[PDB]
Amino acid sequence: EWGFVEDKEVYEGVVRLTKDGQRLRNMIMSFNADIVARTPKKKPFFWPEQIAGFEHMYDGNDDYPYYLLNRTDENSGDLPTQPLAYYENPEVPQANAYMLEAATSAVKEVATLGVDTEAVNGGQVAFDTVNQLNMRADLETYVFQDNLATAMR
Amino acid sequence: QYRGQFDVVRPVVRKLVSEMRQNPIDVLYRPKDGARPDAADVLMGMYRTDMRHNTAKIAVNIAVREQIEAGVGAWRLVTDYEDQSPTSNNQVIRREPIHSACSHVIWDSNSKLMDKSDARHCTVIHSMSQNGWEDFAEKYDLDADDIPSFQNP
Amino acid sequence: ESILSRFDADWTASDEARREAKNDLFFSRVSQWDDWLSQYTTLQYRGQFDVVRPVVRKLVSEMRQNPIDVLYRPKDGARPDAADVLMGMYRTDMRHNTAKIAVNIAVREQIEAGVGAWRLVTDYEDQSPTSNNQVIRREPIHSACSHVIWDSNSKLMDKSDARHCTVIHSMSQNGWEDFAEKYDLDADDIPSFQNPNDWVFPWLTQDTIQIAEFYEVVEKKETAFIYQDPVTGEPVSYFKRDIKDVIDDLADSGFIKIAERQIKRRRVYKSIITCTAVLKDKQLIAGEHIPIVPVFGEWGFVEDKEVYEGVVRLTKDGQRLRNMIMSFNADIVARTPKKKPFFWPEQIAGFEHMYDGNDDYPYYLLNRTDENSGDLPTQPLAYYENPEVPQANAYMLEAATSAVKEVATLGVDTEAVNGGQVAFDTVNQLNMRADLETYVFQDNLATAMRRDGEIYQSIVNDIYDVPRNVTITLEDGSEKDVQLMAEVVDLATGEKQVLNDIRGRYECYTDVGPSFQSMKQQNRAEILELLGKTPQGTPEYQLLLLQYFTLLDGKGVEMMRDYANKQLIQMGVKKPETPEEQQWL
Amino acid sequence: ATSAVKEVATLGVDTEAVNGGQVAFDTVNQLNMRADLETYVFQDNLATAMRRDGEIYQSIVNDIYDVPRNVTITLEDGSEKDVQLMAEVVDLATGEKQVLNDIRGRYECYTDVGPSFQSMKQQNRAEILELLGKTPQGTPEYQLLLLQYFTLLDGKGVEMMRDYANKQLIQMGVKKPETPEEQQWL
Amino acid sequence: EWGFVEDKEVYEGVVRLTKDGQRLRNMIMSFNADIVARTPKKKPFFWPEQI
Amino acid sequence: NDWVFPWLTQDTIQIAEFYEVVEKKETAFIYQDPVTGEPVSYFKRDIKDVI
């Protein structure tokens, strides 16, 4: 089942509809599986002197006190500085909502074929009419070419 | 990185494969009144006295899936005229569809529908099958070094 | 290089692991052990995820639709053997396992994993000769196809090619005493195979000592009726034909040859495949009927071998995120020493015993008295964090809700038909009844003869040669009782082992198809409605008199067989099997 | 996390009525019964016979008859003569054999595997999971029901199938009870 | 009647999902029971000059 | 017994008796020489079909 105008017969098909259309799914893969390399590396930064200590810090030994801090700082005076923001966030979760919904809608479209309550001259479709008989490609029982016959004895 | 999880498009056509239940469409050789019905003595045994237990009814479906997947072809036959101990009329024909091997096959002849005589037989090609190679025993067996050269896909 | 045959052509298969291990072997493992492969730095405390199994099991149990019970199939073409007394073909079949249930443990994994059948001892195992019938069949055991890659496969189940391909079980030890039933073998067959250890040998199992048994391998036998000519003395007189007639008969003219199925023979030299090792010294076992039926499925791929079907890979990386959220959550509670109570403990931790009793109203630790700094307030009521509550992963997986389950997709419909029976019913019924190789007419051991013709009565045939007259039953008689009044004791035609071909030897009728047939199934199975198809009538009830008996094989109810059959009189309905009731005058 | 526990406890989720929930685990049952019988009845070496399969002493009653002269038969009339278990002439061929050995009697009588119900007039009376009253009726369908609701066989008062049927109604003859002797007159 | 892998094998139970299937419910247990003893007296404190 | 574990009970007091382990019984009466050598005149059977 192929339609054509140009000498290369082009298919007519279903699954090729949404191929790149639903790459909208891979945009969750383009964030958490790929550009997640932005990894938080969250540092509370206020008074650990210089950040490089001995290995005890991130191994979590039974010795509790985390104090690294002592301050006599650079000369400016009467002014703060606020690190608060830190690193990054998840990406603006709005505009991505309807894309997947449209793809899935086009998907529930292909689940509608000859839809009936039930029965009432049921669900025969194009593919049945074309696929019904290879028995009629097997139609041959000496139907035109007759050779074999009973011939009692 | 980590890819090959996508898939998930399948189920849309999984509804289209399952209609096979009604694919049989049972009907058996309705006679006419213009021929001789008195010769019908053998007719009542057509599905019986020759081929009775028949697996090939599933072989239709093997073509049914690949159909929506891709084009549907046809393949080799072993003559149904067989065995020993001759018997009565006993004729029905068979064909068992295989899976694909039509991929790079290129046909330009007619390729619409064939009820009647038409083009006889033209082109059959398979790439990297095995099948009846070492089974040459009963056909010709002279040399068979011919083996044309193609650009393999 | 002639004798060696296919193994050198089969080395490209078993050379090394390549891609047919990592990709394929996921077929049967998904239900077991774990998922992740390449991703670096995987962490601990969850060692068995499952999160596959719920997919397959229930739907594997959704294939149970296949009783398909219709039996004792009568032959409609001509007389089947023995008729009324032969009903017992299914005798030993229905009692234990086989097609009724054991197909459960037999088929097992097909769509999820590789499928097939496994070993057997001899063929027909029952000892004692007797009058009854017998049916015995396969009893495979354990899951030996994982690493198996066996190639001769281009086609189908029923193919006429080399039968059952090749037979090897991966490793067998108990079997050491199982094949001990042969004659005094040196017991060391010492095969050398390479099962890749990557030279560090992670697993230590050393099992060896494997054999293979057969005699006729790919026995090639065709019609080939006397095709050759004596003139010119051509070599290679090996016979060939397609259709018997062609040239028709040159016989009555000339060319008398007349040799029938006696050949001093050469056979194909593929032998117990190996380079330098062969034995082939006087062993004979039956012939290859081989009722053992390994089954092999069908799905899409270029050609030759395949990466076969599985449905679970949609979820595998939907699984990974349920495992990775424990990488984003359970770890940070361990990364947090929970609260560090320092706002101006200038003296750090002194007086440790103030942590003894953990009450101590006078906490202190606080004085100021320091260098020049200035007042710089701090508000870590949020501590220092950029907290992200998992809002993204939730919806990322909400589109994957049904797709992370993605199964049990079948059997969805209102009611009745258009239901949950897909090709797998007819494909696994192809795992059941579709084998053409078993059939009936096979003649090997003595199951073959029924009456046998007695192999005697020729010597007694002289009675019809007696002179004077020949007369049928006369002169009454009284004590006769049972039938078979015997003087001539003569039959016709002949009785032998088999019936030849397509006469009398047929096996099983119809195909996959209706569950209703011609024997008295009306009875107790109707789910919704009941009756109204055949209401009352005056002849109707004398029609339904003989119908409704459900007996099959009963005991107390058997007087049915009497009926009115004493005197046929005005009814004379069935004209039945046994003359013994009806023959009195 | 709740969605994990819902998965494992589900076996054959179904609505109601037909299309039941039988699993392979149900078949452990007759794997256990077969784990009994074929470990017992598949070997009978000694005791099947009650006393040595008749003790083979009684054969001595054969003493005078096989002599070629005439043998006494044809009881003159008789009324109460019909009672079971008497021995005078004792016309019988050979005798029963113990264990298994040569001829038939070795291995017999096992269950018919299938749905829940059985038949000793049972899946006749099954009904249950599919509606009710599936029995059709007709005018002489009550001669099928001259058996009526009789069900449990050997019971004391369901025994009506025998005594009530034992004499006067024998003009019918559809019955076949277990009763030993009868005959005699009216 | 179960599946198989090799030889005879570690037994597959329905409890293989239930091992950690309870998961982190227990984490809400972490904040309450005995760990108030770890916390030294939630201190309501201000302007307490009593020296 | 993992020798570090405090658990008390050690002694057992009970046993069992083997019977058949790889013990082969054979009948195998047929098919060997009547008179001349009688070497290995008794051995197991393969096919039951016919001589």
Short mmCIF file of N, CA and C in Angstrom, two decimals, chain D residues 24-151:
data_model
loop_
_atom_site.label_atom_id
_atom_site.label_comp_id
_atom_site.label_asym_id
_atom_site.label_seq_id
_atom_site.Cartn_x
_atom_site.Cartn_y
_atom_site.Cartn_z
N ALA D 24 -0.87 -21.16 38.87
CA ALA D 24 -0.12 -22.40 38.96
C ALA D 24 -0.04 -22.91 40.39
N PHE D 25 -0.09 -22.00 41.37
CA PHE D 25 -0.03 -22.42 42.76
C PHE D 25 -1.19 -23.34 43.12
N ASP D 26 -2.36 -23.15 42.49
CA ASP D 26 -3.48 -24.04 42.74
C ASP D 26 -3.10 -25.48 42.38
N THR D 27 -2.34 -25.64 41.29
CA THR D 27 -1.95 -26.97 40.85
C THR D 27 -0.94 -27.63 41.78
N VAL D 28 -0.45 -26.95 42.81
CA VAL D 28 0.35 -27.68 43.79
C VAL D 28 -0.52 -28.77 44.40
N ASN D 29 -1.83 -28.55 44.45
CA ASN D 29 -2.72 -29.47 45.15
C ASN D 29 -2.58 -30.89 44.62
N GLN D 30 -2.82 -31.08 43.32
CA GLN D 30 -2.71 -32.41 42.74
C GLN D 30 -1.27 -32.77 42.42
N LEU D 31 -0.32 -31.83 42.55
CA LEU D 31 1.08 -32.24 42.69
C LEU D 31 1.32 -32.91 44.03
N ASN D 32 0.55 -32.52 45.05
CA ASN D 32 0.65 -33.17 46.35
C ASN D 32 -0.09 -34.51 46.36
N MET D 33 -1.28 -34.56 45.76
CA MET D 33 -2.01 -35.82 45.71
C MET D 33 -1.26 -36.84 44.86
N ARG D 34 -0.71 -36.40 43.72
CA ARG D 34 0.20 -37.26 42.98
C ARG D 34 1.47 -37.54 43.77
N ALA D 35 1.89 -36.61 44.63
CA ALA D 35 2.99 -36.88 45.54
C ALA D 35 2.61 -37.90 46.61
N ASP D 36 1.33 -38.25 46.72
CA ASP D 36 0.91 -39.36 47.57
C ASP D 36 0.77 -40.64 46.76
N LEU D 37 -0.22 -40.68 45.87
CA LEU D 37 -0.65 -41.95 45.28
C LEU D 37 0.51 -42.69 44.63
N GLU D 38 1.18 -42.06 43.67
CA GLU D 38 2.18 -42.79 42.90
C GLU D 38 3.37 -43.21 43.76
N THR D 39 3.45 -42.72 45.00
CA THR D 39 4.40 -43.25 45.97
C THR D 39 3.85 -44.45 46.73
N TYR D 40 2.57 -44.78 46.54
CA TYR D 40 1.94 -45.92 47.19
C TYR D 40 1.44 -46.92 46.16
N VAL D 41 0.34 -46.61 45.46
CA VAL D 41 -0.32 -47.58 44.60
C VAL D 41 0.57 -48.01 43.45
N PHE D 42 1.57 -47.20 43.09
CA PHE D 42 2.46 -47.57 42.00
C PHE D 42 3.35 -48.76 42.36
N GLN D 43 3.36 -49.16 43.63
CA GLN D 43 3.96 -50.42 44.07
C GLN D 43 2.97 -51.14 44.98
N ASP D 44 2.45 -52.28 44.52
CA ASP D 44 1.73 -53.21 45.38
C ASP D 44 2.48 -54.53 45.28
N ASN D 45 3.27 -54.84 46.31
CA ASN D 45 4.01 -56.10 46.34
C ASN D 45 3.21 -57.23 46.97
N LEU D 46 2.48 -56.94 48.05
CA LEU D 46 1.87 -57.99 48.87
C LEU D 46 0.36 -57.82 48.97
N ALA D 47 -0.13 -56.82 49.70
CA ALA D 47 -1.51 -56.84 50.16
C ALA D 47 -2.40 -56.07 49.18
N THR D 48 -3.16 -56.83 48.40
CA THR D 48 -4.37 -56.45 47.69
C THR D 48 -5.37 -57.53 48.06
N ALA D 49 -4.96 -58.76 47.81
CA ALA D 49 -5.65 -59.94 48.29
C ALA D 49 -5.96 -59.84 49.77
N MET D 50 -7.18 -60.26 50.14
CA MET D 50 -7.57 -60.28 51.55
C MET D 50 -6.90 -61.45 52.27
N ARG D 51 -7.29 -62.68 51.93
CA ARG D 51 -6.56 -63.87 52.37
C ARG D 51 -5.98 -64.54 51.13
N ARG D 52 -4.69 -64.29 50.88
CA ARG D 52 -3.92 -64.92 49.80
C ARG D 52 -4.76 -65.08 48.54
N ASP D 53 -5.61 -64.09 48.26
CA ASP D 53 -6.44 -64.06 47.06
C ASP D 53 -7.34 -65.29 47.00
N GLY D 54 -7.90 -65.64 48.15
CA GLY D 54 -8.77 -66.79 48.29
C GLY D 54 -8.15 -67.95 49.04
N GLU D 55 -6.85 -67.89 49.35
CA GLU D 55 -6.15 -68.95 50.08
C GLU D 55 -6.03 -70.24 49.27
N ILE D 56 -6.71 -70.31 48.13
CA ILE D 56 -6.57 -71.36 47.12
C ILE D 56 -6.75 -72.74 47.75
N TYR D 57 -7.44 -72.80 48.89
CA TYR D 57 -7.84 -74.09 49.44
C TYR D 57 -9.14 -74.60 48.83
N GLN D 58 -10.04 -73.69 48.45
CA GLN D 58 -11.38 -74.09 48.05
C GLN D 58 -11.39 -74.85 46.74
N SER D 59 -10.31 -74.79 45.96
CA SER D 59 -10.26 -75.51 44.70
C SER D 59 -10.55 -76.99 44.88
N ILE D 60 -10.34 -77.53 46.08
CA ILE D 60 -10.56 -78.94 46.34
C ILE D 60 -12.01 -79.35 46.12
N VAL D 61 -12.91 -78.38 45.93
CA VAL D 61 -14.32 -78.67 45.68
C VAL D 61 -14.50 -79.19 44.25
N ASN D 62 -13.43 -79.21 43.46
CA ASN D 62 -13.51 -79.57 42.04
C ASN D 62 -13.48 -81.08 41.80
N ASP D 63 -13.51 -81.89 42.86
CA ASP D 63 -13.16 -83.30 42.80
C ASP D 63 -13.69 -84.37 41.84
N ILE D 64 -14.96 -84.26 41.44
CA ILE D 64 -15.67 -85.41 40.86
C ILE D 64 -16.24 -84.90 39.54
N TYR D 65 -16.38 -83.58 39.37
CA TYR D 65 -17.20 -83.08 38.26
C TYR D 65 -16.52 -83.26 36.91
N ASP D 66 -15.23 -82.93 36.80
CA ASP D 66 -14.60 -82.94 35.49
C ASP D 66 -14.53 -84.35 34.89
N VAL D 67 -14.83 -85.38 35.68
CA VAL D 67 -14.94 -86.75 35.16
C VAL D 67 -15.97 -86.77 34.04
N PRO D 68 -15.72 -87.47 32.93
CA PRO D 68 -16.56 -87.28 31.73
C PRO D 68 -18.04 -87.59 31.90
N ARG D 69 -18.46 -88.26 32.97
CA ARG D 69 -19.87 -88.61 33.07
C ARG D 69 -20.69 -87.34 33.36
N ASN D 70 -22.02 -87.49 33.38
CA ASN D 70 -22.90 -86.34 33.40
C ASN D 70 -22.79 -85.57 34.72
N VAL D 71 -22.92 -84.25 34.62
CA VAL D 71 -22.79 -83.33 35.74
C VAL D 71 -24.17 -82.76 36.07
N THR D 72 -24.46 -82.66 37.37
CA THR D 72 -25.80 -82.32 37.83
C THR D 72 -26.02 -80.81 37.76
N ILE D 73 -27.03 -80.39 36.99
CA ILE D 73 -27.38 -78.98 36.80
C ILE D 73 -28.91 -78.93 36.82
N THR D 74 -29.49 -77.76 36.54
CA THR D 74 -30.93 -77.59 36.33
C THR D 74 -31.71 -77.92 37.61
N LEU D 75 -31.57 -77.02 38.58
CA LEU D 75 -32.39 -77.07 39.78
C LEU D 75 -33.86 -77.13 39.41
N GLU D 76 -34.59 -78.05 40.03
CA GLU D 76 -36.03 -78.15 39.79
C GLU D 76 -36.72 -76.99 40.50
N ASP D 77 -37.39 -76.14 39.71
CA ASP D 77 -38.10 -74.95 40.18
C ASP D 77 -37.29 -74.20 41.24
N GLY D 78 -37.87 -73.95 42.40
CA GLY D 78 -37.21 -73.26 43.49
C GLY D 78 -37.74 -71.85 43.67
N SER D 79 -37.67 -71.37 44.92
CA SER D 79 -38.24 -70.08 45.29
C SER D 79 -37.21 -69.23 46.03
N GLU D 80 -36.84 -69.66 47.24
CA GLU D 80 -35.82 -68.98 48.02
C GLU D 80 -34.41 -69.40 47.65
N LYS D 81 -34.26 -70.28 46.66
CA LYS D 81 -32.97 -70.85 46.29
C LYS D 81 -31.97 -69.82 45.80
N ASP D 82 -32.40 -68.59 45.53
CA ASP D 82 -31.60 -67.64 44.76
C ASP D 82 -30.55 -66.91 45.59
N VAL D 83 -30.48 -67.14 46.90
CA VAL D 83 -29.65 -66.30 47.76
C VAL D 83 -28.18 -66.41 47.36
N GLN D 84 -27.45 -65.32 47.59
CA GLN D 84 -26.06 -65.17 47.19
C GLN D 84 -25.14 -65.96 48.14
N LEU D 85 -23.93 -66.25 47.66
CA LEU D 85 -22.90 -66.95 48.44
C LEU D 85 -23.39 -68.33 48.92
N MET D 86 -23.47 -69.24 47.96
CA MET D 86 -23.48 -70.67 48.25
C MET D 86 -22.42 -71.35 47.40
N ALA D 87 -21.90 -72.47 47.90
CA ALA D 87 -20.88 -73.24 47.19
C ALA D 87 -21.25 -74.71 47.20
N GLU D 88 -21.56 -75.26 46.03
CA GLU D 88 -21.65 -76.71 45.87
C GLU D 88 -20.89 -77.12 44.61
N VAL D 89 -21.42 -76.74 43.45
CA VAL D 89 -20.76 -77.04 42.18
C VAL D 89 -19.62 -76.06 41.92
N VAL D 90 -19.86 -74.77 42.14
CA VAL D 90 -18.82 -73.75 42.04
C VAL D 90 -18.20 -73.76 40.65
N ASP D 91 -18.92 -73.23 39.66
CA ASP D 91 -18.38 -73.06 38.32
C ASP D 91 -17.71 -71.70 38.26
N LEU D 92 -16.38 -71.70 38.21
CA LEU D 92 -15.60 -70.47 38.20
C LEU D 92 -14.25 -70.78 37.56
N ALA D 93 -13.69 -69.80 36.86
CA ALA D 93 -12.43 -69.98 36.14
C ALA D 93 -11.27 -69.39 36.94
N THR D 94 -10.34 -70.25 37.34
CA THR D 94 -9.07 -69.85 37.97
C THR D 94 -9.40 -69.07 39.25
N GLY D 95 -8.78 -67.92 39.48
CA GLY D 95 -8.94 -67.16 40.72
C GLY D 95 -8.13 -65.87 40.58
N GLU D 96 -8.41 -64.92 41.47
CA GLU D 96 -7.74 -63.63 41.43
C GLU D 96 -6.29 -63.77 41.89
N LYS D 97 -5.46 -62.84 41.42
CA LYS D 97 -4.03 -62.86 41.69
C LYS D 97 -3.63 -61.60 42.46
N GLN D 98 -2.67 -61.76 43.37
CA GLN D 98 -2.22 -60.66 44.21
C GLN D 98 -1.20 -59.80 43.47
N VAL D 99 -0.73 -58.76 44.15
CA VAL D 99 0.33 -57.88 43.67
C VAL D 99 -0.05 -57.39 42.27
N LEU D 100 0.84 -57.47 41.29
CA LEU D 100 0.56 -57.03 39.93
C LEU D 100 0.97 -58.11 38.94
N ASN D 101 2.27 -58.35 38.83
CA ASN D 101 2.84 -59.44 38.03
C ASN D 101 2.43 -59.28 36.58
N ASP D 102 1.74 -60.25 35.97
CA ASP D 102 1.71 -60.37 34.51
C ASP D 102 0.57 -59.57 33.88
N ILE D 103 -0.68 -59.97 34.14
CA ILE D 103 -1.82 -59.48 33.38
C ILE D 103 -2.34 -58.21 34.06
N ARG D 104 -3.53 -57.75 33.65
CA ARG D 104 -4.12 -56.48 34.03
C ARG D 104 -4.46 -56.44 35.52
N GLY D 105 -4.72 -55.22 36.00
CA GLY D 105 -4.98 -54.96 37.40
C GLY D 105 -3.91 -54.14 38.09
N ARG D 106 -2.80 -53.85 37.41
CA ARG D 106 -1.70 -53.10 38.00
C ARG D 106 -2.11 -51.72 38.50
N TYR D 107 -2.37 -50.79 37.58
CA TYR D 107 -2.45 -49.37 37.90
C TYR D 107 -3.68 -48.77 37.24
N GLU D 108 -4.58 -48.21 38.06
CA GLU D 108 -5.89 -47.80 37.57
C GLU D 108 -6.49 -46.79 38.55
N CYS D 109 -7.56 -46.14 38.10
CA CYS D 109 -8.43 -45.35 38.98
C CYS D 109 -7.76 -44.13 39.59
N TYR D 110 -7.51 -43.09 38.79
CA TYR D 110 -7.05 -41.80 39.30
C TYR D 110 -8.08 -40.72 38.93
N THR D 111 -7.82 -39.49 39.39
CA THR D 111 -8.74 -38.38 39.26
C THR D 111 -8.76 -37.82 37.83
N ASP D 112 -9.84 -37.09 37.53
CA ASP D 112 -9.96 -36.32 36.30
C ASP D 112 -9.73 -34.85 36.64
N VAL D 113 -8.60 -34.31 36.20
CA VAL D 113 -8.24 -32.93 36.51
C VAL D 113 -9.05 -31.99 35.62
N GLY D 114 -9.42 -30.84 36.18
CA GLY D 114 -10.28 -29.90 35.49
C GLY D 114 -10.78 -28.82 36.42
N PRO D 115 -11.95 -28.24 36.10
CA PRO D 115 -12.52 -27.21 36.98
C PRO D 115 -12.86 -27.74 38.37
N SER D 116 -13.45 -26.89 39.21
CA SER D 116 -13.64 -27.23 40.61
C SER D 116 -14.53 -28.46 40.77
N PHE D 117 -15.74 -28.42 40.20
CA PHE D 117 -16.71 -29.47 40.48
C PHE D 117 -16.36 -30.78 39.80
N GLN D 118 -16.99 -31.83 40.32
CA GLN D 118 -16.88 -33.21 39.90
C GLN D 118 -18.20 -33.61 39.24
N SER D 119 -18.31 -34.89 38.87
CA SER D 119 -19.62 -35.48 38.65
C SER D 119 -19.71 -36.82 39.36
N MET D 120 -20.46 -36.86 40.47
CA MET D 120 -21.41 -37.93 40.74
C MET D 120 -22.73 -37.18 40.80
N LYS D 121 -23.44 -37.14 39.68
CA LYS D 121 -24.57 -36.25 39.51
C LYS D 121 -24.30 -34.92 40.21
N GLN D 122 -23.25 -34.23 39.74
CA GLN D 122 -22.78 -33.03 40.41
C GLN D 122 -22.70 -31.86 39.45
N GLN D 123 -21.85 -31.94 38.42
CA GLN D 123 -21.92 -30.86 37.44
C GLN D 123 -23.17 -30.96 36.58
N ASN D 124 -23.93 -32.04 36.73
CA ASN D 124 -25.36 -31.99 36.44
C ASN D 124 -26.03 -30.92 37.30
N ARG D 125 -25.82 -30.98 38.61
CA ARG D 125 -26.41 -30.07 39.58
C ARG D 125 -25.51 -28.89 39.92
N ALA D 126 -24.39 -28.71 39.20
CA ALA D 126 -23.45 -27.62 39.47
C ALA D 126 -24.11 -26.26 39.63
N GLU D 127 -24.60 -25.69 38.53
CA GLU D 127 -25.05 -24.30 38.57
C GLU D 127 -23.94 -23.38 39.09
N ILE D 128 -24.14 -22.79 40.26
CA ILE D 128 -23.23 -21.84 40.90
C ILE D 128 -22.81 -20.73 39.94
N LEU D 129 -21.51 -20.60 39.65
CA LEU D 129 -20.95 -19.37 39.11
C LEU D 129 -21.65 -18.87 37.86
N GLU D 130 -22.38 -19.71 37.13
CA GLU D 130 -23.18 -19.24 36.00
C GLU D 130 -24.65 -19.43 36.34
N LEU D 131 -25.31 -18.33 36.70
CA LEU D 131 -26.76 -18.24 36.88
C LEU D 131 -27.38 -19.46 37.58
N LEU D 132 -28.51 -19.96 37.07
CA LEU D 132 -29.34 -20.92 37.78
C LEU D 132 -30.25 -21.60 36.77
N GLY D 133 -30.74 -22.78 37.15
CA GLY D 133 -31.82 -23.43 36.41
C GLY D 133 -31.53 -23.68 34.95
N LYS D 134 -30.32 -24.13 34.62
CA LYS D 134 -29.96 -24.40 33.24
C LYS D 134 -30.62 -25.65 32.67
N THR D 135 -31.36 -26.40 33.48
CA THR D 135 -31.93 -27.65 33.03
C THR D 135 -33.15 -27.39 32.15
N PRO D 136 -33.13 -27.79 30.88
CA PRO D 136 -34.36 -27.76 30.08
C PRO D 136 -35.31 -28.87 30.51
N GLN D 137 -36.59 -28.68 30.19
CA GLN D 137 -37.61 -29.65 30.51
C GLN D 137 -38.50 -29.92 29.30
N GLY D 138 -39.14 -31.08 29.32
CA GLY D 138 -40.05 -31.52 28.29
C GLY D 138 -41.05 -32.47 28.89
N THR D 139 -41.98 -32.96 28.06
CA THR D 139 -43.04 -33.81 28.59
C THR D 139 -42.49 -35.12 29.15
N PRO D 140 -41.83 -36.01 28.34
CA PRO D 140 -41.09 -37.14 28.92
C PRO D 140 -39.63 -36.81 29.20
N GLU D 141 -39.40 -35.65 29.81
CA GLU D 141 -38.11 -35.38 30.41
C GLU D 141 -38.14 -35.76 31.88
N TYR D 142 -39.34 -36.03 32.41
CA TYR D 142 -39.50 -36.46 33.78
C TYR D 142 -39.19 -37.94 33.97
N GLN D 143 -39.13 -38.72 32.89
CA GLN D 143 -38.50 -40.03 32.98
C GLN D 143 -36.99 -39.90 33.07
N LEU D 144 -36.42 -38.80 32.59
CA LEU D 144 -35.08 -38.44 33.02
C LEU D 144 -35.11 -38.02 34.49
N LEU D 145 -36.23 -37.43 34.93
CA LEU D 145 -36.41 -37.01 36.31
C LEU D 145 -37.22 -37.99 37.15
N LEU D 146 -37.60 -39.17 36.63
CA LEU D 146 -37.95 -40.24 37.56
C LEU D 146 -36.76 -40.63 38.43
N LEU D 147 -35.57 -40.14 38.10
CA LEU D 147 -34.44 -40.12 39.02
C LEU D 147 -34.53 -38.95 39.99
N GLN D 148 -35.32 -37.93 39.66
CA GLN D 148 -35.54 -36.74 40.49
C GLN D 148 -34.24 -36.12 40.96
N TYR D 149 -34.20 -35.71 42.23
CA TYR D 149 -33.09 -34.96 42.79
C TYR D 149 -32.09 -35.88 43.49
N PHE D 150 -32.25 -37.20 43.36
CA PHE D 150 -31.37 -38.14 44.04
C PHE D 150 -29.92 -37.78 43.75
N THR D 151 -29.12 -37.67 44.81
CA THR D 151 -27.79 -37.10 44.68
C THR D 151 -26.71 -37.97 45.32
#
